[PDB]
């Protein structure tokens, strides 16, 4: 019962809040003589220095779990890739508080990686459910040539194949391209109207400008872009009427770290009350042994249930992602974000707010356009 938690938290106020949450969890629920220990380390900008410092300050401290948060800063990386890879050498589980990248989803690339927020899988699920409940049967996918975009495209295709539906065009464009006019013209020369977009901030801004200059902001066009494209230049140039997502609770660091601490404490208590746990290596350098209880801890975390959190029931999918996460269908109105739809418990509940469509539409448009020009 000398468990220690290293974790990686940005800034210092988050570190203090994590320490307070750890102390509160120690003084609540299952309490023993010595539950665990509280430690933390800053998320310094240098990737190599951060990785080496994390290894030195966590492996030597006999850590069982580590919480890592990814700031959404676009200019600098600050990605959890180095810490996740260093933890991948051993079998120490990690939790991603604000990891929105789909690269960590694959278990081969990151073996002992978990997180409490779905990067874009649940976003695509919400897209599919909204399309199903709003009577849409046409998809214009604008997935960029990136790993997260390809993962989102694969998830969307798998969801579509459940109802035996297929998008008429899944054309993709390379990130950073400034010649999306040809792609927009190809999209125009189709039988579909609903457009699904998923790209970076700069790419979203570029395609929004191209759509504005190609008269794609008029009536009959529906945009279901994700949360990543509702900030920065993407939000500045976003045409009115885009139905975006908000990821309710707003990737709140306090709530996420509290839930992570609770889940880690519950899993540690269950592991202690179940069987023995192999001690972590005493030093970051000296041994290359694989943890014999790492897969067991991963399975326990996967099967772990947490209902006392802010989001009620908390469970992990087969890929270690949050299930039934809360999402808000945000519709732009007069260059302002207005809440219309709420997603919770795989349900869609529109509110009294009207979802205004691009071009000043009052009624629900149709995804099928009868061109009457069958070549």
């Amino acid at each position, epitope marked *: 019962k000398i468990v220690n938690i290293g974790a990686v938290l*940005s*800034t*210092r*106020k*988050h*570190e*203090q809040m994590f320490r307070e949450a750890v102390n509160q969890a120690n003084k609540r629920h299952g309490s023993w003589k010595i539950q665990l220990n509280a430690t933390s380390v*800053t*998320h*310094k*900008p*240098n990737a190599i220095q951060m990785a080496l410092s994390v290894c030195e300050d966590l492996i030597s401290s006999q850590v069982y779990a580590i919480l890592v948060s990814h*700031p*959404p*800063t*676009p*200019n*600098d990386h600050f990605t959890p890739t180095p810490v996740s890879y260093t933890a991948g050498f051993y079998r120490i589980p990690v939790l991603g508080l*604000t990891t929105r990248m789909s690269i960590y989803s694959d278990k081969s690339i990151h073996l002992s990686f978990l997180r409490t927020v779905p990067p874009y899988s649940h976003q695509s699920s919400v897209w599919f459910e909204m399309m199903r409940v709003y009577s849409w049967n046409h998809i214009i996918l604008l997935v960029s040539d990136d790993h997260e975009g390809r993962a989102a495209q694969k998830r969307l295709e798998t969801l579509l194949e459940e109802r035996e539906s297929k998008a008429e065009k899944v054309l993709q464009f390379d990130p950073g391209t400034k010649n999306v006019t040809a792609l927009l013209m190809e999209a125009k020369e189709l039988e579909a109207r609903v457009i699904i977009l998923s790209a970076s901030e700069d790419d979203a801004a570029t395609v929004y400008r191209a759509a504005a200059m190609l008269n794609m902001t008029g009536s009959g066009y529906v945009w279901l872009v994700g949360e990543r494209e509702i*900030s920065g230049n993407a939000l*500045r140039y976003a045409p009115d009427g885009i139905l975006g997502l908000q990821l309710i609770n*707003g*990737k*709140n*660091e*306090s709530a996420h770290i509290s839930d992570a601490v609770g889940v880690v404490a519950q899993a540690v208590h269950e592991l202690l009350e179940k069987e023995n746990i192999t001690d972590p290596p005493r030093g970051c350098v000296g041994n290359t042994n694989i943890w014999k209880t790492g897969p067991l801890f991963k399975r326990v975390l996967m099967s772990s249930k947490y209902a006392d959190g802010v989001t009620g029931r908390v469970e992990f999918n087969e890929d270690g992602d949050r299930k039934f996460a809360n999402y808000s269908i945000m519709n732009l109105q007069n260059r302002k974000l207005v809440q219309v739809g709420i997603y919770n418990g795989t349900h869609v509940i529109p509110n009294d707010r009207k979802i205004i469509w691009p071009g000043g539409e009052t009624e629900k448009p149709r995804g099928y356009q009868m061109s009457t020009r069958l070549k």
Partner: antibody
Amino acid sequence: EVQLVESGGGLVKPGGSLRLSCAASGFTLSDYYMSWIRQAPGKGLEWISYISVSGTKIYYADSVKGRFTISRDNAKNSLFLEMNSLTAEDTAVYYCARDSGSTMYDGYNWFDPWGQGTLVTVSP
Amino acid sequence: DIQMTQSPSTLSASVGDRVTITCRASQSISRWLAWYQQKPGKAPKLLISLASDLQTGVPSRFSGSGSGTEFTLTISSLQPDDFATYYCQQFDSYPLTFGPGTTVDIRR
């Protein structure tokens, strides 16, 4: 255009109570964080406190801890600051600005835009 | 807490000359720092966020830099409207300490 209007200032003797009204225009105040910061004439800038969306978490500055009161009106889109036991160190211009707590996720605390501010001076 | 030191306290430069501002923190605060420009008799305005991002409506001449405990602000070309006092506020942890002045002015 976003403009912040500061009012409620004036002359208050030391040990008195004064109310500062921070009028917010061009945006909805309920979905943003606000803070008060003072700057003594010829000195640096000192942050006072911040008001959360829920209003249950305010971090008063150590110099003014337990003496000031902060309130907000979502319907009026205005911020009201209450100060008590004013002293010589309170002779500074107080500015209310939109914080960055709700900008991306949390934690960031850059202040923009800044209003013209108001001057509070104590004189017996 | 965290104390930021700017050296020199007062500096001058001519119009069109490169301007460098040095901000040093007491401890390593990664890149959680912001820059402000306060005109005489006017409230400060945010210029650089996270010491590496340029805010909208701000000319591209301003360019922040630095990481960890040392930060540097660089201006490609000085202009008359840039004559003001600059600060490097940090938000690593409460209290939100504010950096000292810079007092950018002209050299005769």
